[PDB]
Design a protein around this ligand. Structure first.
Ligand SMILES: [Zn+2]
Ligand SMILES: [Zn+2]
Lengths: 49, 90, 55, 126, 154, 63, 32, 157
């Protein structure tokens, strides 16, 4: 309730944080410990774009 | 405002003039003498007190009380100031 | 008429003087007596702290 | 008993580790612990406990409520050994000034203020 | 020791025959400016307790002073010791010793009585009046004084 | 666990349990060189001792 | 790090500070 | 040996002999008035610390003129909010009125701080002595001292 808006009911994070951590958790469900940095490397150049 | 000057004393009353003098000069001077509470001041009258250092001064309590270390010292600029009755007014 | 004491206290009633502000007289709160602020110009504190003796 | 306790630093805003304890008993039927504390600006707070809870009073309020002396006379009793230590002189003039700043210029006004501030915890008749 | 003096306890034992010694709670004198000193004493001299109780007064041009011989304000060095005044003639070597009294003189002001009626100050609250014992006078600790301000802003 | 905390008196040691009137002792001290706490100590206080009689500050003594 | 009280980037209102108290009470402030 | 001299930390109180604070009230204007302090720092001779430190006295005085007075002005500013060399040190703050230093042999220096009359009062001697115990002239970061006096052998070498 602290880190979310109470009008539009969204998380007030930057969206890249949410999508990166979502994809990293999806990868860590299947134990692929390699790709949690690879996703970060993809998102940093995608936000540089 | 105004200074609260006062005389308001219901059971109390003033005191007249006596034989103390305010006459000062180069002949006499003052000495504050502090003594014990049970000290009889009359029984030094034929004895000699010092004015510097120490002296075991003979005295007369019931038998003898010659054990009296009389001390003497420079003034500490003590604020205890003598009030003498005036010579121009009683 | 006057008294001699510490200059951070009023000489007439012994009360604490307040700290000297913009004006040129410090007024005692209790007795109502004005202290000239030029009388503060006589103090020198002159403290000294040694760290290592010379000998 | 003058002692040093670092846990006293976690007790106020500028409390030091220095302080003088005191265990006062009255004819072996009362016992009250009390502490003076030292503050970094040379000010002394007076701890006292009433019904297992602590209260912190500046020293000038207690010293000004106990006697009908002038402020200069209370000053001369606190600097009495160390006449020339000007830090102590400024500190005890500041402690006497704290009470003056709160409109307590007599003993009776200090007693009135201290009875006003401690009547709820103290529970006298009204 | 070379200096000495012949003692002589002169002066009869009486109340105002005692010399009077004066202090002041606000400082040293350094200048006696037209201070009218007046010493009052009780009317009853027949009971030993209420006699030998005196009050010394002094009026300056701007503030007046009062000192007792008794009660709260008297000195412990009047009871635990006994003070004398030695008048010493340097020619005759005579120490005329008179009895002495020491007064500590306090400044006298008017009295205040306006807060006797003014005593009700939002007395409907009882434990919201507990905030008086949780401020810079009679504070409980740093925790209580820093936390009971506006209920930690909740 | 109670080593050094639960101590025992020696055979000669004893606890003061008698109670007396000490009304004569401060006047006795002032008959000696102890100046009363109101009176001037006749020396600098930096060359004097504070006197305490049972948590009552009696006066000051020339060292 | 990322779950903090911030301004909303979507509706652009101020940060409504939510406070817990005594593990039993949540209070919110209406922003201006 | 020069490395052991260069790695040992030196504090400011290690080379100070004494600090002479001299506060005087000075109301030189009809409106403005100031607390004129003066701070005579006095140092040991360098012969008392050639054997452990590597300081020449002018290096101490350059430390005083550059870093310590900036620390002192920052400290009084933190408490507040609730002949070409002499110019170069007086320009670091508006209130510093005068500077003196031993131009001959450099064992003393003397500022005059000259603060205004604030409402709160603090001890300038306490700040000066606390900073003089808290200041470091030079130190390698994270090293407090150094000792080469061990002559332990491994295989009798
Ligand atoms: Zn929103
Ligand atoms: Zn006054």
């Amino acid at each position: 309730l602290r880190g979310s808006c109470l009008n539009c009911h969204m998380l007030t994070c930057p969206r890249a944080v949410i999508h990166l951590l979502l994809c990293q958790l999806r990868v860590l469900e299947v134990g692929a410990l390699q790709a949690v940095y690879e996703l970060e490397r993809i998102l940093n150049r995608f936000l540089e774009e | 405002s105004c200074p609260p000057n006062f005389t308001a004393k219901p059971p109390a009353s003033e005191s007249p003039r006596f034989s103390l003098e305010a006459l000062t000069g180069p002949d006499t001077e003052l000495w504050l003498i502090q003594a014990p509470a049970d000290f009889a001041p009359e029984c030094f009258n034929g004895r000699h007190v010092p004015l510097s250092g120490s002296q075991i001064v003979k005295g007369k309590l019931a038998g003898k009380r010659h054990r009296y270390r009389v001390l003497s010292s420079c003034p500490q600029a003590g604020e205890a100031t003598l009030l003498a009755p005036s010579t121009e007014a009683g | 008429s006057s008294f001699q004491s510490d200059l951070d206290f009023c000489s007439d009633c012994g009360s604490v003087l307040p700290l000297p502000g913009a004006q040129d007289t410090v007024t005692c709160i209790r007795c109502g007596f004005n202290i000239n602020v030029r009388d503060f110009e006589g103090k020198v504190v002159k403290t000294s702290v040694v760290f290592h003796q010379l000998g | 008993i003058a002692m040093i306790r670092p846990k006293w630093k976690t007790r106020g805003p500028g409390y030091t580790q220095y302080g003088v304890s005191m265990h006062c008993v009255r004819e072996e039927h009362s016992a009250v612990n009390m502490n003076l504390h030292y503050l970094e600006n040379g000010t002394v707070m007076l701890n006292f406990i009433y019904r297992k809870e602590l209260f912190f009073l500046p020293l000038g309020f207690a010293l000004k409520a106990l006697v009908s002396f002038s402020d200069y006379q209370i000053f001369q009793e606190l600097i009495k050994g160390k006449e020339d230590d000007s830090f102590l002189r400024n500190s005890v003039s500041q402690m006497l000034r704290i009470v003056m700043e709160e409109g307590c210029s007599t003993q009776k006004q200090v007693l009135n203020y201290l009875g006003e501030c401690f009547r709820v915890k103290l529970n006298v008749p009204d | 020791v070379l200096p000495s003096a012949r003692w002589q306890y002169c002066g009869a034992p009486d109340g105002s025959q005692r010399a009077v010694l004066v202090q002041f709670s606000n400082g040293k004198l350094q200048s006696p400016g037209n201070m009218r000193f007046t010493l009052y004493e009780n009317k009853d001299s027949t009971n030993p307790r209420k006699r030998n109780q005196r009050i010394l007064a002094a009026e300056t041009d701007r503030l007046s002073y009062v000192g007792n011989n008794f009660g709260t304000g008297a000195l412990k060095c009047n009871t635990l010791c006994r003070h004398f005044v030695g008048i010493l003639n340097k020619t005759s070597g005579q120490m005329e010793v008179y009895d002495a009294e020491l007064f500590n003189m306090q400044p006298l002001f008017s009295d205040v009585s306006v807060e006797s009626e003014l005593a009700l100050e939002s007395q409907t609250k009882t434990y919201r009046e507990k905030m008086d014992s949780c401020i810079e006078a009679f504070g409980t600790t740093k925790q209580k004084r820093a936390l009971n301000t506006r209920r930690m802003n909740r | 666990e109670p080593c050094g905390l639960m101590n025992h008196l020696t055979a000669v040691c004893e606890v003061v349990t008698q109670f007396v009137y000490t009304a004569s002792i401060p006047a006795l001290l002032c008959n000696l060189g102890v100046t009363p706490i109101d009176g001037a100590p006749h020396r600098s206080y930096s060359e004097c001792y504070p006197v305490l009689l049972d948590g009552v500050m009696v006066g000051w003594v020339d060292k | 790090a990322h779950m903090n009280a911030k301004r909303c980037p979507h509706c652009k209102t101020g940060r409504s500070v939510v406070r817990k108290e005594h593990n039993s009470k949540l209070t919110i402030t209406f922003p201006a | 040996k020069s490395l052991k001299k260069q790695l040992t930390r030196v504090c400011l109180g290690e080379v100070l002999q004494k600090i002479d604070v001299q506060e005087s009230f000075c109301m030189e204007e009809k409106q403005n008035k100031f607390q004129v302090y003066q701070l005579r720092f006095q140092f040991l001779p360098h012969a008392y610390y050639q054997q452990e430190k590597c300081l020449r006295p002018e290096d101490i005085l350059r430390f005083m003129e550059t870093r310590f007075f900036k620390l002192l002005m920052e400290s009084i500013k933190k408490k507040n909010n609730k002949e070409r060399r002499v110019q170069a040190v007086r320009e670091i703050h508006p209130f510093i009125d005068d500077y003196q230093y031993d131009t001959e042999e450099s064992l003393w220096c003397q500022v005059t701080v000259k603060l205004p009359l604030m409402k709160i009062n603090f001890d300038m001697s306490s700040l000066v002595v606390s900073l003089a115990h808290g200041a470091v002239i030079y130190a390698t970061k994270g090293i407090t001292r150094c000792l080469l006096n061990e002559t332990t052998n491994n295989k009798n070498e």
